[PDB]
Every structure is written in structure tokens, then in C-alpha cells.
Design an enzyme around this catalytic site. Sequence first.
Site, PDB file in Angstrom:
ATOM      1  CD1 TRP A  30      -2.516   1.851   0.442  1.00 32.46           C
ATOM      2  CD2 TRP A  30      -2.259   1.605   2.656  1.00 32.46           C
ATOM      3  NE1 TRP A  30      -3.276   2.823   1.062  1.00 32.46           N
ATOM      4  CE2 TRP A  30      -3.135   2.688   2.420  1.00 32.46           C
ATOM      5  CE3 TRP A  30      -1.949   1.253   3.981  1.00 32.46           C
ATOM      6  CZ2 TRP A  30      -3.698   3.428   3.459  1.00 32.46           C
ATOM      7  CZ3 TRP A  30      -2.500   1.997   5.007  1.00 32.46           C
ATOM      8  CH2 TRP A  30      -3.370   3.069   4.740  1.00 32.46           C
TER       9      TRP A  30
ATOM     10  CB  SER B  94       0.679  -5.927   1.356  1.00 30.62           C
ATOM     11  OG  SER B  94      -0.337  -5.201   2.003  1.00 30.62           O
ATOM     12  CG  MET B  95      -1.829  -2.658  -2.016  1.00 30.67           C
ATOM     13  SD  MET B  95      -2.545  -1.058  -2.395  1.00 30.67           S
ATOM     14  CE  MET B  95      -3.276  -1.417  -4.016  1.00 30.67           C
TER      15      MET B  95
ATOM     16  CG  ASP C 155       0.090  -9.764   8.182  1.00 28.40           C
ATOM     17  OD1 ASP C 155      -0.379  -8.665   8.555  1.00 28.40           O
ATOM     18  OD2 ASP C 155       0.464  -9.973   6.992  1.00 28.40           O
TER      19      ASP C 155
ATOM     20  CG  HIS D 248       1.351  -6.611   6.438  1.00 26.44           C
ATOM     21  ND1 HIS D 248       0.823  -7.673   5.734  1.00 26.44           N
ATOM     22  CD2 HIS D 248       1.150  -5.513   5.671  1.00 26.44           C
ATOM     23  CE1 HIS D 248       0.286  -7.233   4.609  1.00 26.44           C
ATOM     24  NE2 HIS D 248       0.465  -5.925   4.545  1.00 26.44           N
TER      25      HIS D 248
END
Lengths: 271, 271, 271
Positions: free
Chosen positions: A28, A94-95, A222, A251
Site C-alpha cells: 500500500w 500485501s495489496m 500479521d 506484515h
Amino acid sequence: STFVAKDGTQIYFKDWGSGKPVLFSHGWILDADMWEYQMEYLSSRGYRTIAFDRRGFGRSDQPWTGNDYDTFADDIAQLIEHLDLKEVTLVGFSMGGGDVARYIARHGSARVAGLVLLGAVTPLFGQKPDYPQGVPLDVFARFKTELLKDRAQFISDFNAPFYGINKGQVVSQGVQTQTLQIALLASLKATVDCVTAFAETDFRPDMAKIDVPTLVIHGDGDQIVPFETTGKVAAELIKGAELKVYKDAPHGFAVTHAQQLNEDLLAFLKR
Amino acid sequence: STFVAKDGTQIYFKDWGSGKPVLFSHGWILDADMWEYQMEYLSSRGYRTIAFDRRGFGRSDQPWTGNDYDTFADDIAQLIEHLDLKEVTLVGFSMGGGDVARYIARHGSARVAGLVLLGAVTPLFGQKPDYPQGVPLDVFARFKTELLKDRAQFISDFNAPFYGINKGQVVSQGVQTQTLQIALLASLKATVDCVTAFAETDFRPDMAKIDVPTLVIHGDGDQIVPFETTGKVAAELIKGAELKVYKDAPHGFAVTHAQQLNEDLLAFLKR
Amino acid sequence: STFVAKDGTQIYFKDWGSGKPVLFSHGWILDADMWEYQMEYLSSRGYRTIAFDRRGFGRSDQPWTGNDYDTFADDIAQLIEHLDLKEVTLVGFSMGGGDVARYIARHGSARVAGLVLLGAVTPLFGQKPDYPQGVPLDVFARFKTELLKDRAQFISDFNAPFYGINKGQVVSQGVQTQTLQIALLASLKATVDCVTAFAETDFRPDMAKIDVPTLVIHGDGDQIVPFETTGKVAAELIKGAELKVYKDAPHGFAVTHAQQLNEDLLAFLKR
Ligand SMILES: [Cl-]
Ligand SMILES: [Cl-]
Ligand SMILES: [Cl-]
Ligand SMILES: [Cl-]
Ligand SMILES: [Cl-]
């Protein structure tokens, strides 16, 4: 380097070394620099490594429109086209796990040798009628409210649960400074729109379209992207996927578990 | 401003004012902004000042290849030709002393009025069989190991001996923040390859090629690039070179001794 | 996005959304990012928002010459021409109040629907023979001396009176970090010349050329640009101008009073 996407958005990327290509999609509020150690590691060992700053982030242009996964996936398609890549190993964090999955779903896998999903939001992050175990939308709505008041302090506070510093992970002040510096390069608009996108986008149809070797890696400590409802499920839904769980990892494990990740990426490429 | 090097690398530079040109080559993990006070000082006094971000640093592109002194020298040649500079005074700080020297060694001095070597790695920095007094290579190997683990914290810790803060020099928090912010713009790859380049490159042949007026300035408190084995020797090896030693000055003396440096550069130009 | 000004200077800007255009001019040692919350707010509500990094600042080029209000005003004209903007509402903060006023003065108001002056230096900041109530020029001379010694520490120290932190305004460390990061992107030369520009430039003639609806907003706790001799007088001198005073608000009120400002801007545009 730069290329211009369909709508005129200029996208920054780095393209290092030679050999079989590995294309990295950042998380992100990060940019292509989050991958510098993996890129150095693999490019010094016979691979070509490519990483872009997502639209709205890092050194890329900050368009008002197109901050959604379909556009993100098409931006990747354009980069792949621009460099004429073949047998690319796609790596999303992640994203950024969502745009590499969505690229495969929208464009197929003819150019793709493999897929790696790292602490990824796939197959679905937020709640849906048949997925009440996902993160409730009002959690994301709160983040957006906070970002629309003071994103700089939001990012600064996000460092601790991102890296698991509040649970005994050790990350230098230097890394925390670099994380905040990079995050501030991004557009406020893209930062908030990405929350909408990862909160609401469903990649379960995408999982059924993934027909390449796939490695899923996730930390089970996470705090941002819950392992039980994301990486664990992605690995079950993708036919033939391998799963590796980094015990207690946070994370931001490309930092805390850098060497382990480098070795796992190498081992996957040499499979 | 930008120019494009032979291999496609886009290089950022600033070109300020008018008059006889003074071209500045920055040190390691810095960028053209390290010269901003010297540039303002001289361009307000009727000189043209030019400073570039070395490939892999600041606002320049980050190529995987070409992170070596022959390429750095050729980048400088391209800039000089790009702008058609004549009677240029070359000014190199720290590792940047090496690429101005190597530019003269590879291209000759037709376009060059004078050379200034500031806290420079010239004529040789690392140990060789006939130069046991140089810095042992395992010292640089350790730096590389540490940069490949956490470059952000390496740079942060580097501030203290760089500016001699660990030995009582006073440098503001602002300057230390700006130094880290600029350093983090750089490529991890260029940052590490530069260590190899300045550790191993021998500029002793280059010294015999320097046939222009030369000023060597070095701090005798320099903890990074030791005066006794670098600037002291460079001044003896370059025919007609002048030497100025700044008493108790650190490596980062363009900051700590800004005004004295400005005045010495002006005096050299006016000689 | 970028355009190239008359003298070759490349200027960065953002152009977001669709609808009636609102063009923002930032203050000193900031860049277009200072407007991100106002731009998101208005562009999510049917307006097109445009904000540029002034030459010498942010992501724009850093020219040696042209760091003066006439050129600043002509840069704005060239951006308006570049995008063929019509019925534009001009919004200027701090020193940026000067270039929007000077743009009207030099180019007329054919393209302009309205003017907003926020903590602006208009109509005159520094002392003149008929304006002894202005800020004495020795005050700005001293700023320039400090900036030419250590601009980074100057900026860091400036955060407190800018945001009113020294008088109990609450501003996060994140915002202060972001402010310093952005300020350090700027040219030392542009930073110093802007002081000369806002110290000495008289916008009183400009006030008589403003024939469009105008809203002046100013905080009366402003420690940087004193309300009594700037905003108060600008509101009296511009025909039909409206004045709003934010009680005890500091100079940096786009941060401390963001929501109140957004609502006032929207109310103005809808009038
Ligand atoms: Cl190995
Ligand atoms: Cl299976
Ligand atoms: Cl001699
Ligand atoms: Cl009034
Ligand atoms: Cl009020």
C-alpha cells in the site's frame, strides 16, 4: 525508467540485470524501493528484476481516476507489453498481491511462469455476505476518516503494527524513517482510494484462473492482513499452490525476514 | 535539467548562472544538493555553476550496470559535451574526486581550466600490495555486508563520523535529516557498487595525466578518507598542485567549513 | 503532469477531477501537496482542482533566474493557457497570494471567476516609505543570512511559529516531518530569492485591478504574515471583497483549520 499508461499516467519503474524476469508489485503506502534487497539478491544471481511504483505512489504520476484493481492490473499488462516480457514470475506483496492476481484474471497467463503472493490481501480481505470472517467495512471506513484528517501521522503510527514492533520485532529507526519518507511521496487520493479497493475487491474468481506454479508466503503474526482469512485460503483455492508460513512474522516481513524470503524466492525460481 | 547517458541512463543536473563554468561532482550517498551553498556563493559572484546527481543517486536513474569510475568519468564527459563547456574548473568531493580525475585521465584537459580535489579518495584509497598504508579491503567488505542488511540505518550511523560529530563537531539536526533524506533517494545497488569502486580503483596513473592548476583541500580530522594516504599524496603527485589542510576539519567539511571553502574556491578561480 | 515555461523551466502540477476549475498557489517552502486535503474535498464534490509546484520548489525545476513575482504570475498564465482554463477560481496561500494577484494584474481577469487570499502577503508585506507599519527589511535580511548558513535547521525551527505550536496549536509530528521533507526538495536559491520577492514586492496597485468576487481568510494569531497589515488591508482595498478571520488561527491554518477552510471554500464556490 518510465512508461505512459493508456490514460496518460506516467509510471516509474526499475529494470535490473538480465535473464528470466521477476516482476514485483509493492504494498500500500510503499513504492518499488521496498523490493531493493530482493532485487539485488536475485539480479546478482542471474535474474532480471523489475519493480514499478503503482500509480499514485513513489515517483509515479498521481491521477485522480483509475485507482482500482482493474486499472492496476492493466498498468501491469502495459509494463509487460512495453518490455515484451516472457516467462515472468509475478511477485505481489500485501495489496500488491491483488493486482498480480487480477492481471492474470484479465489477461491470462501466457506470459507468466509463476506467481508469488506475500502477505497478500488475496483472495478477499473485507467482509462480504458469504465472507463474514473478512474485515468489516467500518474498520476500513475509520482508516479513511483518519487518513483524510492526517495521513502523515496515520503512516507514522502504522509503522509499529506493520513491522510488529509492538510485538517484539526489531526494526531500525532508519527503516521506519525510510518507510515514512516513501509513504509521503504518495497521493492522498491514491492512498485513500487504495483502501476502498482492497477493502471491497473480491479475488475469489481470480484464484480459479491461476494456472501457474504459485507460492504463498504469509506471517501468522500479521496484524494488518490476517493470515487465516487471506494467505491460508488463497493457497487452498489456487490449484497446486504451495504455502509457507513464517512463524510469528509480521506484515512487513520483507524487512524482518529478508534473508529467508530471498532464499525462498530463489528456491521457487529454481524449482 | 536532465541528460541521457550513452546507455540510456537519465542524469539530473542543475546549471546555474553565467560566466566561466565550475562543475561539481558529489561524494558517496549525497547528491547535487551538497553543493548548493558553493553554487549560490559562486553564481552570485559571476560564475556558472553546474552539479549533477551521479547515476544511481538523488534524482537520477538507477541503472544496474555502469556503477564504476570509467562510466562515471564518461558521464561527466557527456555532460561537458552536452553543454559545450570550456575552461571548466572541476571540483570533486570524496569519491567524486575520483570521477573528475578519471575524466581527465580518459579524455584529457582541453576543456579544463583547473581541478579541485576536496577530501578526495585520490590517488588511491584501498590497500594494494605496494600500498599497505591504504584502507584494508575487509573494512569495505564489512560496509557492504552492513549496507546489504540495512542501508537506512547504516547511513544514519554514518552521519556521526562523516561530520566528525562523534569528535565534537557541531552539525544541526536539520543537516543530518537532509543528509539521510537525500541518501535514501539513492539505489541500494549503486550505493554498494560505489564502495567496490572507491575501495579498489587506483588513480595513481591519473595523477600523472593532470596538467592543469590543481588545489587539494583536505581536513586533517578526516575519519572517512584519511588525509595522510589520500589528499597529502595526491598533492605531491600532481605537478604544481597546491595543498590546503583544514585544521581539525572532518570529512563533511563543505558543511562544517562552508565559508572558508567558498572563499578558497573563489580565490582559486581568481588566481 | 508538467509544462514548460517561457524560459525552459519545467513545472510540476496536479490536475484532478472535472467541473469548474480551482487553481491553487502554495506558500513558501511548501509545494502542491499542501493543498491535498482541499483538492480531495472539492474534487470529490464536482470541482476540477489544479495545483502546481512553484519553480524552485517541490518536483519542479530549480532555475537560477526568474525567481520573482512577475515571472511567478506569468508561470500561472502559462499553466492556465496550457490547460485552456475558464471561469477559474484562484486560491493563494501566504506568498502564493502574491502570484495569483499579480497574475490578475498582468493578464486581466477574463479567465477568472473568483479569488481567494489565505494568510496572504497581499497587499504589501515589508516596509515602504508610505508603509512603515510593514515588516522592516532587516527582519528579512536576517532570515536570508540564516538560510544561507543552514536552511535545513531554519525550516525545522520555522515549523513552530508557522503552525502556532509555540502558542498551543496541536500539530502532529507527522505533519512537521512532511513539512520539512517537502521544504528540503526546494532550491536554496529559490528559497532565498522568494524572501527578497515577498519582502519587497508591492501588490497595492494589483488590489485595484481585482474585479472579481474575492474572499480573504486570515488567522489573527498569524505569527508570520501579520493580519493587521496584510489580509485586513487587502479586504478593504479590493472592491466588494469578503473577509473571514479565524480566531487565534496560525499561519499554517490549512492544517490546523482544514475542515473549516474546506467548507468556506465550498461555500464561496457555490455562492
Ligand atoms: Cl549464495
Ligand atoms: Cl491442489
Ligand atoms: Cl611540482
Ligand atoms: Cl473588510
Ligand atoms: Cl473562527
